[PDB]
Design a protein around this ligand. Sequence first.
Ligand SMILES: O=P(O)(O)O[C@@H]1[C@@H](OP(=O)(O)OP(=O)(O)O)[C@@H](OP(=O)(O)O)[C@@H](OP(=O)(O)O)[C@H](O)[C@H]1OP(=O)(O)O
Ligand SMILES: [Cl-]
Ligand SMILES: [Cl-]
Ligand SMILES: [F-]
Ligand SMILES: [Mg+2]
Ligand SMILES: [Mg+2]
Ligand SMILES: [Mg+2]
Length: 134
Amino acid sequence: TRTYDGDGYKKRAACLCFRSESEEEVLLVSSSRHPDRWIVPGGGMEPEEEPSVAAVREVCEEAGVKGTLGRLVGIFENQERKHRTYVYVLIVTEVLEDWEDSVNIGRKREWFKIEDAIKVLQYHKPVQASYFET
Ligand SMILES: O=P(O)(O)O[C@@H]1[C@@H](OP(=O)(O)OP(=O)(O)O)[C@@H](OP(=O)(O)O)[C@@H](OP(=O)(O)O)[C@H](O)[C@H]1OP(=O)(O)O
Ligand SMILES: [Cl-]
Ligand SMILES: [Cl-]
Ligand SMILES: [F-]
Ligand SMILES: [Mg+2]
Ligand SMILES: [Mg+2]
Ligand SMILES: [Mg+2]
């Protein structure tokens, strides 16, 4: 079940899934609609679900990783798609082989240097590119 803020924006959460504490490489996953494109893994908060809990859950489902949850980066609106995303740091400690979306929809995942992640997100996901601005 999808959830919404008072203004009708869909509530979402995501993590910047870093390979280490140095936050130099981040994990992106393929778009479900357009598999040749990259996105930051994240998705809808469930009813009464804490955003940090939604973030870790969606990362597990879409990217097949787990780790140590870090700081809230910020809350980011996508005015065109009418959604509002809480974005957390996650330092990846486990990479699992046969994750929900791998199995279900053949979703891919790849490590990017920060500069390269920003480059591949810019065209279709400029708000997700902005996650990395600070
Ligand atoms: O699951 P939704 O329908 O609320 O939203 C997904 C939208 O889903 P969210 O991430 O906002 O929510 P869930 O991860 O909980 O499906 C997201 O889907 P996915 O999760 O499959 O990546 C979007 O795809 P993309 O960013 O991968 O191209 C998808 O277009 C978008 O579908 P829409 O209803 O906007 O047609
Ligand atoms: Cl890193
Ligand atoms: Cl977005
Ligand atoms: F989802
Ligand atoms: Mg999802
Ligand atoms: Mg999603
Ligand atoms: Mg979901």
